[PDB]
Symmetry: C3
Subunit: 534 residues, 3 copies
């Protein structure tokens, strides 16, 4: 008939994309360097009706973004404080007055004067000291040890990741969603919930719970090279303690440089440990196994302790009160499944190497007084051995963050598109995504306004401006530099689409339309420009 190409700007469609997210948050906490903005007290969420979106938590790049930011916050926080290089001296370690794993070591240090030395004493844990005037600190032949800045807390603070202009974060609200495939209930959020950067290994602590059942999710449930994340719908409490009453002693190493050493232990020498109720753990496993037999045939399932390797892998590690615990979980993962209190002994280390980075040790100063913390086991990390065998494990931190970020996806908004019309020359952002084209075209200002809304942030902002200007330059070239709806003189070709006006405007959505003419947009764009020059 007489249909013409009409250009619409601010169209609610999107394509998958990677970008830089900014944090939002709400002393001297290690996770609060204030490189990022405060949160909005009332974040918005818009349910997109009739939107199906394919998610894949294993390919999610928000995970890589979080992992990198976490490492940087940690490293920035350790820069402004004392190096323990001066302590790499021979230690004389004995056990003369401690027990009837902790050594009493004497050594020579300098004072604030470079011409003077004194003999001092400190207690060290056996795991931090290696034999060679008998002993050496464990990392003196590898690297310099930085002590944790003493006023910095390691207690996690929820971090929200929020989208930059031109982008949106979609959230999957399917209660049974495992991690991949279509989500039938998708909402747009300004940003994520707060995610606590809790560091742990075999058991995931203080995370989110599943709402209906235990969800077992993996990239490939039949592989052995992939880990399995098990999300519980009920928490199990774990009570951990450090029963020794340690005294902190302050040793002057240099001109304003203090070292914090463990002084005498008051009272009994006792072993650190964690308490898990016996019945709650057993109910948890009955449920985990019941749901594991839904992926595996009806085979005997056995749980074993991990096979070996570094303490950071074989034990359950965590930061409790600022001390670093390495707990033995062989008391949990030791059972066979077919058709009281658990006490886990723990070790404490002061010299640690986080995120598996060799050559960058940190010394955690001792914390004075007794320590107790109560954590929630909210999930497990399991691995299959080559009857099925499962062992706890995986020291790769990205698998912890995948358990919180699995619901989120980042997409880029693609505001420009065309459709045939007969002219001739409040839902909120993306709320109209599920609306038909003839309804969604009435809310174009909503998306157009969201295109403008350190170095990584300057690059993101400069680029958002450049993207905006390139689209405006293009519209100026085609004509209608100031319009959201622009009628052109290019006749519509029924070969691009032979759908009627009612089929296009009353039934279809913009997201579907974008697919129907995806192979013709370069032709159409060239015709619009060529016709302007005539």
């Amino acid at each position: 008939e007489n249909l013409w190409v009409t250009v619409y700007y601010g169209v609610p469609v999107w394509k998958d994309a990677e970008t830089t997210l900014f944090c939002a948050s709400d002393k001297r906490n290690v996770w609060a360097t204030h490189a990022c903005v405060p949160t909005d007290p009332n974040p918005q969420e818009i349910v997109l009706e009739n939107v199906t979106e394919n998610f894949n938590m294993w390919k999610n790049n928000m995970v890589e973004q979080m992992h990198t930011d976490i490492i940087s916050l940690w490293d920035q926080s350790l820069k402004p404080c004392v190096k323990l290089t001066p302590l790499c001296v021979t230690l004389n370690c004995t056990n003369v007055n401690v027990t009837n794993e902790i050594k009493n070591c004497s050594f020579n240090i300098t004072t604030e004067l470079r011409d003077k030395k004194k003999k001092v004493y400190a207690l060290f844990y056996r795991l931090d000291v290696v034999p060679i005037s008998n002993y050496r600190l464990i990392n003196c032949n590898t690297s310099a040890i930085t002590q944790a800045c003493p006023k910095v807390s390691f207690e996690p603070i929820p971090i929200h990741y929020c989208a930059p202009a031109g982008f949106a974060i979609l959230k999957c609200n399917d209660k049974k969603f495992n991690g991949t495939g279509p989500c039938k209930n998708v909402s747009t959020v300004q940003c994520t919930h707060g995610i606590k950067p809790v560091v742990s290994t075999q058991l995931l602590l203080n995370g989110s719970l599943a709402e209906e059942e235990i969800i077992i999710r993996s990239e490939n449930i039949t592989n052995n090279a992939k880990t399995i994340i098990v999300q519980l719908n009920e928490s199990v409490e774990i009570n951990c303690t450090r029963p020794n009453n340690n005294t902190r002693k302050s040793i002057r190493i240099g001109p304003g440089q203090w070292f914090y050493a463990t002084g005498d232990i008051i009272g009994d020498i006792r072993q650190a440990h964690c308490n898990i109720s016996g019945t709650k753990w057993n109910k948890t496993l009955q449920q985990v196994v019941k749901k594991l037999r839904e992926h595996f045939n009806n085979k005997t399932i056995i749980f074993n302790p991990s096979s070996g390797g570094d303490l950071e892998i074989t034990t359950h590690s965590f930061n409790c009160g600022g001390e670093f615990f390495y707990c033995n979980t062989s008391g949990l993962f030791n059972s066979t499944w077919i058709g009281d209190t658990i006490t886990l002994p723990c070790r404490i280390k002061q010299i640690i190497n986080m995120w598996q980075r060799v050559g960058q040790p940190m010394y955690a100063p001792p914390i004075q007084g007794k320590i107790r913390c109560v954590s929630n086991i909210t999930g497990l990390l399991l691995t299959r051995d080559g009857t099925e065998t499962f062992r706890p494990g995986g020291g790769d931190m990205r698998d912890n963050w995948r358990s919180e970020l699995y619901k989120y996806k980042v997409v880029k908004i693609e505001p420009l598109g065309v459709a045939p019309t007969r002219c001739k020359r409040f839902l909120g952002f993306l709320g109209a995504a599920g609306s038909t084209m003839g309804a969604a075209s009435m809310t174009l200002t909503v998306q157009a306004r969201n295109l403008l809304s350190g170095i990584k942030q300057l690059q993101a902002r400069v680029l958002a401006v450049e993207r905006y200007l390139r689209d405006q330059q293009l519209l100026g070239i085609w004509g209608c530099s100031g319009k959201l709806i622009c009628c052109t003189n290019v006749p519509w070709n029924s070969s691009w689409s032979n759908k009627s006006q009612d089929e296009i405007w009353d039934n279809m959505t913009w997201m579907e339309w974008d697919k129907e003419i995806n192979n013709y947009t370069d032709i159409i764009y060239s015709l619009i420009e060529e016709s302007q020059n005539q």
Copy 2:
């Protein structure tokens, strides 16, 4: 040459030293567009 103006107009937009170069390219573009808006023809390559 007046028939190939879009070719050059598109090439006006196409560490710290690079951010300064990019911020400045944007500012130069906008100053020329502001000037055209003042003269008239804010959206045109050829303005009578």
Copy 3:
């Protein structure tokens, strides 16, 4: 004033921090600094002779 008693004396800040010497070629003589407004902003000046704070 720079030395404190404790082989008798110590520099005054050796138990507190590291002392950086000034660069011997760097003058401390003040140079007038003018502050200027960025685009979108203006600086207003008050010219009342008896104006107080």
